[PDB]
Amino acid sequence: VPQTAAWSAKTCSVMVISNLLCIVAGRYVIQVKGSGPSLPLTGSFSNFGLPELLATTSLGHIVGSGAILGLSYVGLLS
Amino acid sequence: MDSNFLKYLSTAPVLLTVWLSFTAGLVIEANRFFPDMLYFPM
Amino acid sequence: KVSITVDKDPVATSFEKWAQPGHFSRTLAKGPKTTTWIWNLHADAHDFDSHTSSLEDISRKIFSAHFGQLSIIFLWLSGMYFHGARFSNYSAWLSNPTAVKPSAQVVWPIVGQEVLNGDVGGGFQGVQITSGFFQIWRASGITSEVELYWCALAGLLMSGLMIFAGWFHYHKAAPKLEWFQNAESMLNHHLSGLLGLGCLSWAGHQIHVSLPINKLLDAGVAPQEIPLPHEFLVNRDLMAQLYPSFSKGLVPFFTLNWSEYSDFLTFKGGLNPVTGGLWLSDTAHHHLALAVLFIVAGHMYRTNWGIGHSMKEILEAHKGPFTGEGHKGLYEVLITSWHAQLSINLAMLGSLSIIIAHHMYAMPPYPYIATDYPTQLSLFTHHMWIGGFCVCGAAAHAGIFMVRDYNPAQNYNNLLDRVIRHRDAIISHLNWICIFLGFHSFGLYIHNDTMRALGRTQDMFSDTAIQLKPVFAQWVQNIHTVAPGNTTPNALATASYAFGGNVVSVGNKVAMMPISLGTADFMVHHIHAFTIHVTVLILLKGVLFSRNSRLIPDKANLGFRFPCDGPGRGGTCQSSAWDSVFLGLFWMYNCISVVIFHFSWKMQSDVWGTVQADNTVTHITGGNFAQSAITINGWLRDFLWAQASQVIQSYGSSLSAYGLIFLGAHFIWAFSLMFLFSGRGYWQELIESVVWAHNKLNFAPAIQPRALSITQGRAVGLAHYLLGGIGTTWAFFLARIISVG
C-alpha cells in the first residue's frame, strides 16, 4: 500500500503552492469571464471574479491532493 | 362519474380486457370448485 | 443564461380526450373507416414528432413519458422487493446460500400448476428465480423481510412521486424549449449530481452498512445475531472492531492521510474466497473513486459563471483536411433533434449492456452469484439481448433523424454530408469484408464437417490438426495474469481469474477458473465478428440510403417507413430504413443467439463444474467444446441435442413450465413465417371471401376488415420470430441450467 503522510508543514506548503499556481494559471487560461463584479484587486488581477477564484481553488485542491499523494508514493514528501 | 371517463371505460380494449378477465375468473373458479371434469356427469 | 422557465397550466387534466382515440393525430381523429385505423393508432401513439411541429410540445411529452417510465420501473422494483419479503425463501438462503435455491414466486393450485412449486429448499417450495435479487440484497446488507418490506414501501412511494411529477410537469408546470436545450447544464448535473452523488451515496452505504454486515456473514455469524445498520452507524467502536481505522475518524480524509483507510478501502482484486464474489471493500473504493471522477467531470461545461467549455466551440474546432468542416452543425443537430440523441444514447446503452454482461460473469460482483449458475447464464444472455435490441433501435432512430430532421442547408461539407457523399465506398467495402468473414469463418466449419465426414480428421482445423491459435487473446490473458505486482503493483490478485490463475471454489463448486482459448474459440470469435459486421452492414446501409439512392432518388419524401415504391425498377421491396432495421433485427437475433450459445457451452464445458477432493474439477459437459465445437454437427449433437434433454424431459417436474414454453416458443417462431413468407393480396382476397360469407347473413362490421399493411405484416412476422426464438432459447437455457445446477 502506498504511503500517505500525516498533515505537516510540507503538505500545507504543497497545497498552498498548488492553489497559487492554479490561480495564476486560471488568470492566463480562463477564456470567458462571468458577468458580475470582481474581487478587490488591481493590475493583472483586475477581473478576478469569485467564480474564477472558486474554480482556480478547486483545481488547485485537485492538483495539491494529486501532488501530495504522488510525492508520498515516491517517498519525496514523506 | 365523468361521462368522458365512462366512454373511455366503454372503449373496445378496456371492455375486452374486463370481459375476458371476468370469463377467465369464471372458468378458474369453476375449475377450482369442480376440478378435473373431463366429462359431463351422467 | 441557464435558467428555469415554465408554462403554467398548459394542458387541462380531463378525460375528454380519453374517449377520443387518435386525438393526437389529424388523420386518425376522424375515425375508423377501416381496421387499419386501429393498427395506426398504436403504431403512431408515441410518434410525437408526427403529431405536431412544436419542439416544445414534443419535449414536454418526452419529459412526462420519462416520468411515467420511471414510475413503472419503481413499481417493478417495489414488486420484486415485496415478493422477496413475502413470497420468498430469503432467510433460509441467508442461512445456507449454497444449498437452497433462491425463490420469490409462488403459484396457486388451480389446474395442477402447483407442480411448479418445486422443492427449492429451506422448507419452501416455489418457482426458482434467476434474477440475482437475493445476492443483490445480501450485498446490500439486508438480513430480514422487514427491511425488504421497507424497500418495497420506498419503491412504491417513488413510483407515486414519479407519476405525480409526470402529471405536474405536463399539466401544471411544463418547462420550455429554452429549459430543455441546456446540454451543458444537463450534462454537468447528470455527471456530477446523478452519477457522482449516486456512487458517493452507494460508497457511503457500503462503508457503513454492507461492509460490516457482509464481514460478519462471511465470518459465519447468524443473520439474526448481526447488529443493525444504525447500530453500526452510531457505534463507531463496533465498526472500529471490524475495520480498525474508524477509530481514526475523518481527519485522515481531510489531511490526505488516506492510507489510514486501507482496511476498508483497498485494491485487493480477485474474488472473496468465502462468497466467490468481488470484495465489497474493493467495490466501496471503486464507487468512491468513481464519485470523485464524475464530480470532477461534471465541472467541464459553461452554465452561468464563465468557467467551462462550450461544446459548439469544441466541435467546430475539431476539423481536419480529410473532413472539411468537421463537426460543425452537430451541436445544433443534437439540440434540435430528439431522434439523433435517442440513437446515440441507445447505441451507447446497448454497448454498455453487452460490456456489463461480460464483466459481471468474469468478475462476479455479488456474494454467491458465481456458483448460482442459473443466475449467471440468465443475466449474461438477458443483457446481451437488451444490448442487441438497443443497438438496432439506435440504427432505427438514426434513420428516422436522417429522414425527418436532416437538413442539407445546415449540414454542408461537414462529417454527416461527407459520409452521405461517399456512402457507396463504405457499403461496398463493408460488403466485401462481410463476405470475406463469412467465408473464412463459416466455410472453416464446413471444411471441418466435410473432413470429419470423410475420415480425414488430420486435415481439419483443430488443436489436434491444422491449428488456428488465438495467440493475441492468449497474450492478453498472460498479461492480465502477470499484471498483479508488475503492471498493477499494488493489486494483490488479477482482475478476473478467467485470464488465468487459481480456481475459485465455493461450496465445492467452481466460481471462476481460467478460460482457455484454442482453435474452437478462434473460430467462434471470428464468427462473432462476421455476424456483428453483417448486422452493421444492414443497419448502416439503410441509414445511409434512407433519403436517396441510385434506385429511388426521392426516398425522404416517401418517408422513413414505407412499404415499397412499386414493382417498377425491377422491384423496390423493403427499400426503406425501416426495412433495414427489420432485416438487421433478424441478424441481431442471429448474432446474439450464437454469442449466448458460445457462452453456455464454453462455460459448461471448461469453467463450471464440481471440484473433487483431489482438487480436480469435473465440468458439466467435460471438455466437449474443444473437439466438438469445431463442427456444425458438433454443435447440433453435443450442444443442442445433448443439452435439450433437460427441457424435453421436464414434464411432471417443476420445470414442466419450461418444457411447455419451449413448445409454445417453437409454435410462435413457426407462426411468424406465415407473416414473413407471405403478402397482403392473398389475405385481402381471403378476407373478401369471408366478408361475403358475413354479408350473406345480412351483417358485417362498419369498420371494414382489411389485411395488415405490408409494413405491419413485416413487423408482426419479426415480432413473432424474435419472441419464438428467444423464448425457445429461454426455456432451453433455464431448464438445462436449473437441472444441472
Add this chain to the structure above:
Amino acid sequence: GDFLVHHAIALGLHTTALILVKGALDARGSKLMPDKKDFGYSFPCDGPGRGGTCDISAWDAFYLSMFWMLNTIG
C-alpha cells in the same frame, strides 16, 4: 394418437386445398385487382396502392400452398 394425427392430416389437406382453390378461383379477378386475367398467372404484384397487393397472383397461391403441402406431407 392416430385419431389426432389423422385430424391434423385433415387440417393439412383442407388448408392446402383452401390456398389452391382460392388461387384458382380468384385467378381471373378479385375485388382488389378485378382485372387479373389481363396481367396473367405469375405477375409480381399490383403495387402499394389499394392497401398493398403483395402476393395477389395465382402463382403466389401455388407458392403458398407448396409450403403447406410440404407441411402436410411432413
Add this chain to the structure above:
Amino acid sequence: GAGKLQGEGVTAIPFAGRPKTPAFDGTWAGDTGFDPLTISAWLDIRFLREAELKHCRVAMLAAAGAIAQDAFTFPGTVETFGTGKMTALHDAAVKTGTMGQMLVWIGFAEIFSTAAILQWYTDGSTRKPGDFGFDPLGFSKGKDAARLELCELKNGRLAMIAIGGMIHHYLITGKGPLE
C-alpha cells in the same frame, strides 16, 4: 439605523471600496461595506441575510446557553446527563435522547422556514429576510426598530465568534465559558 454607522457611506476596506451589489444599496441593515469576496453579487441578498440572521440567532442563543450552563444548572439535569460540560454535555444529552427530540422539533420549525424561503421564488413572497413576526412584547413597534435591527445583527456577529472561541477554549482547556 444611522447612515453613518450602517449605510451607503460606510467602508470597511478603504483600499477596495463599497461593493456595487444589490446588498449594498444602503437599505439592508448591518451594512459596513464589507464583502471582499463579492459573495452578494452571486447569491441572493435575501438568502444571505436569512442565513446570517439564522446564524446570529443560533450562535447567540448557544453562547447565552453555555454561560447559563456554567453558572446555573437546572435541577435534575446535573444528575441525569452526567457532569460533562459543553460538547460532552451534547453527547450526554444525545444519549439521553434530549438532543434527538430537540432535533425533531427544530426540524419541524425549519420545514416551515424552508417553505418561507421557497416562497420568495415560487410565489414571489415579499417576506423580509429573517422576519417571522415574533415581536410579542412589542419593541419593533416604536422608533427603536432600526436600532434594534442593528443591535440584533451586531450582537449575533459578536456571538458567532464568541461561541467559536468558547468551544475551542473548551476543547483545549476542558473548561466551560466561565474560566
Add this chain to the structure above:
Amino acid sequence: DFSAAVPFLKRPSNLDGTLAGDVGFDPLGFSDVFDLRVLREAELKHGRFAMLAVLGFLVQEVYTFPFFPKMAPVDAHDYFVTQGGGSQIIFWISFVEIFGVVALFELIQGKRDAGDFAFDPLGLGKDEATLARYKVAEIKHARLAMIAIGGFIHQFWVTKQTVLEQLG
C-alpha cells in the same frame, strides 16, 4: 397576503377563509394541486374516525361488553381480527363507503359540501349561527382528536399501559 396562522408564510391562494377552521395553513401546497373540497372531505372523515376512536378507547378502558373478553383497546384489534368481528366492522364500513364514493363524485360535481352528509338526526344544527359555530367546533375537535388518537396508541405501545391507567 400572508397566512393568519403563520405570519411569515403567504396565504395559500385556494384557502380564502370560507371553510371552517381555515387559518391559512397549507405550507406544502396540497391545496394548490388537489381539490380543496376533496381534501376537506378527507379531513372530516379522518377527524370523525379519530374522535370516535378516542371515545372508543376511553369507553373500552372503563367498560367492555359482558360477552367480550376484557382487554386493552389496542389488543382488541388483533383479537377481533381472528374472532371475526373486525371483519364485520370492516365490511359494514366498506358498505357505507360504497355510497361514500357516490357522495364524493357528487362533491366533485359540486352538488354537495365536503363533509356534509345531511346527518342531523336530533336537529341540533337548525339555526345558522349555531351551525357555523358547530362547524368550527367540529373541525377543531376533529384535528385535536386526530392528534390525540395517535398519542393514545403510541403511548400504549411504549408503556403497554392504557391511558387512564397511565395518567396516574
